[PDB]
């Protein structure tokens, strides 16, 4: 009985909640996809200078 209590205590100390990690993973994947597109938008600046010359 004591060993079961100690195992449960350590698990309570260091375990995670995967239900929350799923939501965080979804939001972060969407944000990374948006960040790549934002970098692509930022790269195409200064390309309009060539028309002046």
């Amino acid at each position: 009985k004591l060993q079961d209590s100690l195992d449960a205590g350590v698990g309570n100390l260091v375990d995670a909640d995967l239900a929350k990690e799923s939501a965080k993973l979804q939001s972060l994947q969407t944000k990374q996809q948006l960040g790549v597109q934002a970098l692509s938008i930022a790269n195409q600046s200064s390309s309009s200078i060539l028309s002046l010359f």
Binding site: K31, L34, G35, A38, L39, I41, A42, S45
Partner: protein, 54 residues
């Protein structure tokens, strides 16, 4: 003098308007990159400080 060869104000004013458009574009791109309106202390000092402390 409508025929001056040394200067023309049309180019100056076109340049000024182009620079204004570029500045607005920079602000919008920053909003898109960071995903938030108040990202730094330049955007809004009061709201940025409040959010940091909270």
């Amino acid at each position: 003098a409508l025929n001056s060869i040394n200067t023309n104000a049309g180019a100056m004013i076109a340049l000024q308007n182009l620079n204004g458009t570029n500045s607005e574009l920079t602000t919008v791109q920053q909003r898109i990159n960071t995903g938030k309106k108040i990202a730094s202390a330049k955007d809004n000092g009061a709201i940025w400080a409040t959010a940091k402390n909270q």
